[PDB]
Design an enzyme around this catalytic site. Structure first.
Site, short mmCIF file in Angstrom:
data_model
loop_
_atom_site.label_atom_id
_atom_site.label_comp_id
_atom_site.label_asym_id
_atom_site.label_seq_id
_atom_site.Cartn_x
_atom_site.Cartn_y
_atom_site.Cartn_z
CG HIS A 230 123.20 -25.10 48.39
ND1 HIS A 230 122.64 -24.23 47.48
CD2 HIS A 230 123.49 -24.36 49.49
CE1 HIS A 230 122.59 -23.02 48.01
NE2 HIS A 230 123.10 -23.07 49.22
CB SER B 133 134.62 -26.73 57.35
OG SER B 133 133.83 -26.30 56.25
N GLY C 246 133.51 -21.71 61.79
CA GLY C 246 133.39 -22.49 60.57
C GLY C 246 134.45 -23.55 60.38
CD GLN D 13 124.63 -20.87 44.73
OE1 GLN D 13 125.35 -20.36 43.88
NE2 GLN D 13 123.32 -20.64 44.79
CG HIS E 187 123.46 -13.57 51.21
ND1 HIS E 187 122.87 -13.36 52.44
CD2 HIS E 187 122.94 -14.73 50.74
CE1 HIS E 187 122.04 -14.35 52.71
NE2 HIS E 187 122.05 -15.19 51.69
CG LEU F 276 128.92 -20.48 59.89
CD1 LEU F 276 130.01 -20.72 58.85
CD2 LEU F 276 129.43 -20.88 61.26
CE1 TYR F 277 130.82 -23.38 54.81
CE2 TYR F 277 130.37 -22.25 52.75
CZ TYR F 277 131.17 -23.07 53.52
OH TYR F 277 132.33 -23.58 52.98
C1 COH Z 1 128.29 -19.78 49.75
C2 COH Z 1 128.02 -19.18 48.58
C3 COH Z 1 126.59 -18.76 48.17
C4 COH Z 1 126.30 -18.21 46.99
C5 COH Z 1 127.33 -17.93 45.88
C6 COH Z 1 124.87 -17.93 46.94
C7 COH Z 1 124.16 -17.37 45.89
C8 COH Z 1 122.80 -17.08 45.87
C9 COH Z 1 121.99 -16.59 44.75
C10 COH Z 1 122.41 -16.25 43.30
C11 COH Z 1 123.60 -16.59 42.79
C12 COH Z 1 120.74 -16.46 45.19
C13 COH Z 1 119.54 -15.97 44.34
C14 COH Z 1 120.69 -16.86 46.58
C15 COH Z 1 119.56 -16.87 47.38
C16 COH Z 1 119.33 -17.81 48.36
N1 COH Z 1 120.32 -18.41 49.11
CO1 COH Z 1 122.35 -18.29 48.71
N2 COH Z 1 124.33 -18.34 48.15
C17 COH Z 1 125.35 -18.85 48.94
C18 COH Z 1 125.17 -19.36 50.21
C19 COH Z 1 124.00 -19.91 50.70
C20 COH Z 1 123.90 -21.00 51.65
C21 COH Z 1 125.06 -21.79 52.30
C22 COH Z 1 122.40 -21.24 51.86
C23 COH Z 1 121.75 -22.29 52.78
C24 COH Z 1 120.87 -23.26 52.00
C25 COH Z 1 119.79 -23.79 52.91
O1 COH Z 1 119.86 -23.52 54.14
O2 COH Z 1 118.86 -24.47 52.41
C26 COH Z 1 121.74 -20.25 51.03
C27 COH Z 1 120.38 -20.08 50.91
C28 COH Z 1 119.72 -19.29 49.98
C29 COH Z 1 118.29 -19.23 49.77
C30 COH Z 1 117.25 -20.08 50.55
C31 COH Z 1 116.33 -19.24 51.43
C32 COH Z 1 117.05 -18.64 52.62
O3 COH Z 1 118.26 -18.92 52.80
O4 COH Z 1 116.40 -17.89 53.39
C33 COH Z 1 118.05 -18.35 48.79
C34 COH Z 1 116.67 -17.95 48.20
N3 COH Z 1 122.72 -19.50 50.37
N4 COH Z 1 121.96 -17.23 46.96
C1 LIG Z 2 133.61 -21.31 56.77
C2 LIG Z 2 135.05 -21.69 56.99
C3 LIG Z 2 135.81 -21.03 57.95
C4 LIG Z 2 137.13 -21.39 58.15
C5 LIG Z 2 137.70 -22.40 57.40
C6 LIG Z 2 139.03 -22.77 57.60
C7 LIG Z 2 139.45 -24.05 57.85
C8 LIG Z 2 140.80 -24.05 57.98
C9 LIG Z 2 141.69 -25.25 58.26
F1 LIG Z 2 142.69 -25.29 57.37
F2 LIG Z 2 142.21 -25.17 59.49
F3 LIG Z 2 140.98 -26.38 58.16
N1 LIG Z 2 141.22 -22.78 57.82
N2 LIG Z 2 140.14 -21.98 57.58
C10 LIG Z 2 140.25 -20.65 57.38
C11 LIG Z 2 141.17 -19.96 58.16
C12 LIG Z 2 141.35 -18.59 58.00
C13 LIG Z 2 140.61 -17.91 57.06
S1 LIG Z 2 140.84 -16.16 56.86
N3 LIG Z 2 142.19 -15.85 55.98
O1 LIG Z 2 139.69 -15.55 56.26
O2 LIG Z 2 140.89 -15.48 58.13
C14 LIG Z 2 139.69 -18.59 56.27
C15 LIG Z 2 139.51 -19.96 56.42
C16 LIG Z 2 136.95 -23.06 56.45
C17 LIG Z 2 135.62 -22.70 56.24
#
Ligand code: COH
Ligand SMILES: Cc1ccc(-c2cc(C(F)(F)F)nn2-c2ccc(S(N)(=O)=O)cc2)cc1
Ligand code: COH
Ligand SMILES: *[C@@H]1O[C@H](CO)[C@@H](O[C@@H]2O[C@H](CO)[C@@H](O)[C@H](O)[C@H]2NC(C)=O)[C@H](O)[C@H]1NC(C)=O
Ligand SMILES: *[C@@H]1O[C@H](CO)[C@@H](O[C@@H]2O[C@H](CO)[C@@H](O)[C@H](O)[C@H]2NC(C)=O)[C@H](O)[C@H]1NC(C)=O
Ligand SMILES: Cc1ccc(-c2cc(C(F)(F)F)nn2-c2ccc(S(N)(=O)=O)cc2)cc1
Ligand SMILES: CCCCCCCCO[C@@H]1O[C@H](CO)[C@@H](O)[C@H](O)[C@H]1O
Ligand SMILES: *[C@@H]1O[C@H](CO)[C@@H](O)[C@H](O)[C@H]1NC(C)=O
Ligand SMILES: *[C@@H]1O[C@H](CO)[C@@H](O)[C@H](O)[C@H]1NC(C)=O
Ligand SMILES: *[C@@H]1O[C@H](CO)[C@@H](O)[C@H](O)[C@H]1NC(C)=O
Ligand SMILES: *[C@@H]1O[C@H](CO)[C@@H](O)[C@H](O)[C@H]1NC(C)=O
Lengths: 552, 551
Positions: free
Chosen positions: B176, B499, B495, B172, B357, B353-354
């Site tokens: 971001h 990435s 992804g 996260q 949640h 895709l990232y």
């Molecule tokens: C990858 C891990 C991850 C985590 C752990 C996480 C944890 C949490 C969390 C509490 C811990 C809350 C309250 C939220 C809630 C939100 N997330 Co995420 N989010 C995550 C991935 C993401 C990503 C990536 C975005 C995109 C940011 C953007 O597009 O600005 C995101 C965007 C958001 C937004 C922006 C609005 C929207 O996307 O429509 C909110 C609100 N959220 N998330």
């Molecule tokens: C969002 C995202 C998606 C894929 C990758 C990534 C990259 C790579 C590498 F090493 F080739 F660069 N692997 N690899 C990867 C491959 C397999 C899994 S798995 N076990 O869930 O199916 C999970 C991650 C990273 C980020």
């Protein structure tokens, strides 16, 4: 002071302070090693002995016309030779870019900030004892003195290659899309955040400026019609900010992409030609795609005209400059199997070398008239009274001045030529021989070797004492020209890679862009691959007058 | 309507209208030809025959552990395989970028305007009869129904790969910096004009914000000392704009690079850690270069941390994610003799895709406490009360949820998950099967193949009617996961290129940058090449607690 002030690291080696008075040279991928990166590797020692000098290469490209005639008519060989031309100078330019006026070391600020001109060589450190590092006197010679002694024009010297005013105004028009110096911040800054051929001088740098210039019908640009002739719109109608003296009539205040193109009628000439070409391409695309809307007709046409500009510049503009018998070719395909970064960052030194003030004549001969600078400036009425056709016919015949050789800068632009010297010192440029070494050239061992002549070399020596502290910009204008050429060696070996970098580094040259679909089909694609300075004028100027970059 | 709503052109061929009712496919460099770019050339028939499926390639890297252990101890051989990994996906990503949310065709606006997220696939045309083109009903199923039936979490489903809360917050915090949606413009716009790893989430997006964060002594960042522990400075002390609820005291308004990191204590953790790491590197650089001024100490430190981040993300973050027995390597020298563009543009689909949640827990377990979402948000006092060490210790042992598999989105953030669906439709995303074909994958034939089960597949078919109009985002969350893995096939194949391009495309990975002198000497260069998630915590967090992305 800074331990790297003497510039010890050779062969693109990077200098770093290790203490208050000690340094280290990074010889990574230089092909050399040792304290100063002066000891060559075995493979490097071979590459040196077998490397042809630039003058040797220039001789071959300008001779054996019977051989090039064969080559130029064998598409496979031509493309092959051109493939070499474009891959020859291979690492001369940092891409992604490195230093700028405020950073003699690599930093993220220097990379990210697009406002800066980038730098081929880092500036001289502030606390360095002498202006050029350690060599030379405590002060560089007075710039006015250097200007008047070896730069200012006595008698008009014609270009032996025969460059005309169609060429000179093209060079000014074309380059001032990526040479937009921002004097609000300083000479090291630019307003052209596109850093290349984006045609912002036709469409505008900002989207807000663009929308004022657009008609929003059929994708065209706003225009007016005076005497049945199509000219750019006005400041009043478009509300586009331009640079004009208060005493200029309302209808003669034309609005274009670049704010400064009202300065010269010759620039407005090209500003008018390209505006017509855009609307012309719109017409062609609307015929091919009646389903398309205004926005797509505009965007597609812009990409087409960008391709045209790159097409013309290489195969006409640069071709004329080169003086080669070999026909330069614009074909992005020749880089698809090569290592090449499709990006570009405008160098401050690329800007500086392009100050071709000596190109300017003493008067501007149009029809039966001969206007002076005081008359020609901001006189858009001249363009109107004479018309584009008579502008083309007249400027095709009028000869342009010689850039190198010394003493050919018009007194009218003495304040500009002097400004180039001063600002080069403000941005703390390194010396002439430092930029020669940077681009794999032998340093000049005497002022007489530089000019190939005794008189100016004598004056220069009295001014600078050391040849190793000669400045870049004046040296470019006083350098001994290549045989019957317009430039010297330094202007070419530095200028060629910088020029081709911004041309081939354009996104439309990338595999995903270089397709017929990108330009509206085969029709739009054909417009580009058949474009020329002749066809440009022929398609947009009335009567289709003959034109070229040479007087012949 | 638009003649290309049906998405006729196959195999990366580009579609163009040639009239109100006709179209034309550009089959250039696709390896195919014909009206729809579907007739393969001969060399393509050879290459399509030899091509191994991603499911079997993943199998290899996840088995024969004894043989990978051997390969991981042969430098020349580790290097050569990692080179293949970096180059196995040569033309998946457009660079320089092409389309965005407003331009389903190439244009200078789409290219030059850095405020746009780029698009891997062009948006569906505005005048298309059905939301996905020509297939499916006049409207997509209610996003709420799709959310409740197959996305929301009943029983918490933990990640089989063992991802902890250190992972979830790192992901996260890290992403971001290039995922900063400009909501004043729309979901297709970004505030991060760097489009990559510039560490602006630490230093700031603009120069002004950065200068308000800097100390201008020894190249360090401003900071406060609370109980002997170093923390970010306050908004009052820096005049740095931060997003805080009005009920947050002046002393708890921490000022960091990212304007939104104050809302989650897990982010303020890494924000504190990385801020410490910065000032640590300045100390080192200062006794390596006692002649250096403040500006160079800062700028050089920013480059090293950029290098550290890429190093950590590849060899620890991505490594744990993949589950591959093969040990990945961050080595920019592997790309020098290859065709690669050292530039990047963040894709909108990469952002979508990232949205992991399901990675979130039900409660946030720190030491003796179980904090709900309501208790955790805006509560930086939690961070001060326990401390960094207890935060690292606790987040190391608390497990994360499974992203794929369906039904794992916590109820507390259901509005957010619903927004990911609404905005994907708002940005006119194409269907799941279109994005699969875009990435050299095979389209799903039924919902049962997509999920690997019967219950949810029956639910989706009732909603979407056709597998060819199944949306991209909700599919990523319900997709059949790899054996004991966190992701399905689509999540990985989309992804992984995105990435790897964002990391290696960094200018510091370019040959003229990848020098010891760029980072202040061999000392600073080794800081990058020996960086890890454990060393980052050990060097900056008191007590040097053990941490990783597993257990
Ligand atoms: C990858 C891990 C991850 C985590 C752990 C996480 C944890 C949490 C969390 C509490 C811990 C809350 C309250 C939220 C809630 C939100 N997330 Co995420 N989010 C995550 C991935 C993401 C990503 C990536 C975005 C995109 C940011 C953007 O597009 O600005 C995101 C965007 C958001 C937004 C922006 C609005 C929207 O996307 O429509 C909110 C609100 N959220 N998330
Ligand atoms: C969002 C995202 C998606 C894929 C990758 C990534 C990259 C790579 C590498 F090493 F080739 F660069 N692997 N690899 C990867 C491959 C397999 C899994 S798995 N076990 O869930 O199916 C999970 C991650 C990273 C980020
Ligand atoms: C290449 C051909 C060329 C020609 C023919 C030409 C002919 C003329 C001309 C003819 C009537 C006039 C009045 C000027 C006058 C000027 N030129 Co030129 N210039 C040329 C190349 C350049 C370049 C390169 C710059 C720097 C661009 C910048 O910084 O904006 C420039 C900049 C300028 C400036 C900006 C001030 C500065 O500090 O740079 C003025 C004023 N000029 N020049
Ligand atoms: C990038 O594109 C955006 C959106 O097209 C531009 O933002 C618009 O700017 C105009 C004036 O220039 C405003 O009238 C609009 O309201 C803006 N739209 C939005 C959605 O904010 C932005 O200017 C472009 N960037 C550049 C550098 O041209
Ligand atoms: C690029 O660099 C310039 C100069 O370093 C930045 O302009 C400065 O901005 C600060 C605050 O924004 C001002 O206080 C200075 O007076 C500005 N200096 C000049 C010479 O203009 C500019 O902000 C940088 N660009 C970006 C995008 O950060
Ligand atoms: C500012 C600038 C400088 C050089 C070039 C250039 C490029 C090329 C080529 F062929 F490599 F593309 N040649 N070429 C060139 C070569 C020789 C001369 S000459 N006769 O004055 O010495 C003049 C120009 C272009 C622009
Ligand atoms: C031509 C308008 C500027 C002239 C300024 C003259 C400043 C002194 O310049 C002198 O001019 C002489 C004739 O050109 C040369 O013989 C001398 O070498 C030179 O020093
Ligand atoms: C390196 O350059 C310095 C000049 O700064 C000179 O004194 C020294 O002898 C050089 N050393 C070598 C090995 O060339
Ligand atoms: C150019 O300007 C001068 C005075 O500024 C004026 O006398 C002359 O008529 C103008 N040229 C034309 C063609 O009108
Ligand atoms: C191409 O696809 C269209 C459907 O969009 C179909 O009608 C046509 O027959 C196809 N042509 C070929 C040659 O496959
Ligand atoms: C978290 O916030 C709640 C109120 O929302 C507060 O009662 C609690 O004390 C906070 N946590 C800590 C550790 O202070």
């Amino acid at each position: 002071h800074h331990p790297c002030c003497s510039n010890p690291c050779q062969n693109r080696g990077e200098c770093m302070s290790t203490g208050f008075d000690q340094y280290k040279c990074d010889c990574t991928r230089t092909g050399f090693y040792g304290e100063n990166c002066t000891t060559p590797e075995f493979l490097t020692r071979i590459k040196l002995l077998l490397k042809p000098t630039p003058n040797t290469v220039h001789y071959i490209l300008t001779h054996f016309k019977g051989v090039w005639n064969i080559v130029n008519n064998i598409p496979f060989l031509r493309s092959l030779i051109m493939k070499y031309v474009l891959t020859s100078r291979p690492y001369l330019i940092d891409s992604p870019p490195t230093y700028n006026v405020h950073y003699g070391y690599k930093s993220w600020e220097a990379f990210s900030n697009l406002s800066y001109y980038t730098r081929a060589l880092p500036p001289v450190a502030d606390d360095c004892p002498t202006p050029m590092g350690v060599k030379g006197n405590k002060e560089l010679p007075d710039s006015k003195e250097v200007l008047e002694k070896v730069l200012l024009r006595r008698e008009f010297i014609p270009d032996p290659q025969g460059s005309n005013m169609m060429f000179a105004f093209f060079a000014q028009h074309f380059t001032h899309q990526f040479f937009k110096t921002d004097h609000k911040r300083g000479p090291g800054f630019t307003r052209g955040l596109g850093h290349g051929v984006d045609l912002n001088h036709i469409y505008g740098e900002t989207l807000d400026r663009q929308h004022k210039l657009r008609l929003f019908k059929d994708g065209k640009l706003k225009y007016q019609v005076i005497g049945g002739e199509v000219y750019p719109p006005t400041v009043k109608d478009t509300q586009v900010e331009m640079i004009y003296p208060p005493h200029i009539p309302e209808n003669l205040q034309f609005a274009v992409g670049q704010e400064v193109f009202g300065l010269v009628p010759g620039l407005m000439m090209y500003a008018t030609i390209w505006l017509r070409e855009h609307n012309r391409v719109c017409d062609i695309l609307k015929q091919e795609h009646p389903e398309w809307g205004d926005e797509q007709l505009f965007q597609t046409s812009r990409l087409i005209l960008i391709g045209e500009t790159i097409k013309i510049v290489i195969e006409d503009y640069v071709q004329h400059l080169s003086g080669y018998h070999f026909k330069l070719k614009f074909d992005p395909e020749l880089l698809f199997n090569q290592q090449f970064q499709y990006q570009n960052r405008i160098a401050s030194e690329f800007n500086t070398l392009y100050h071709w003030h000596p190109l300017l004549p003493d008067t501007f001969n149009i029809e039966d008239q001969e206007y002076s600078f005081k008359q020609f400036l901001y006189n858009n009425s001249i363009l109107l009274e004479h018309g584009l056709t008579q502008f083309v016919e007249s400027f095709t015949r009028q000869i342009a001045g010689r850039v190198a050789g010394g003493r050919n800068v018009p007194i009218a632009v003495q304040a500009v030529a002097k400004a180039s010297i001063d600002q080069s010192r403000e941005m703390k440029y390194q010396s002439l021989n430092e930029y020669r070494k940077r681009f794999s050239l032998k340093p000049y061992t005497s002022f007489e070797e530089l000019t190939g002549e005794k008189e100016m070399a004598a004056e220069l020596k009295a001014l600078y004492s050391d040849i190793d502290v000669m400045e870049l910009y004046p040296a470019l204008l006083v350098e001994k020209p290549r045989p019957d050429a317009i430039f010297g060696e330094t202007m070419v070996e530095l200028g060629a890679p910088f020029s081709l970098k911004g041309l081939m580094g354009n996104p439309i040259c990338s595999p995903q862009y270089w397709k017929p679909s990108t330009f509206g089909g085969e029709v739009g694609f054909k417009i580009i691959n058949t474009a020329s300075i002749q066809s440009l004028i022929c398609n947009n100027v009335k009567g289709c007058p003959f034109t070229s970059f040479n007087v012949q």
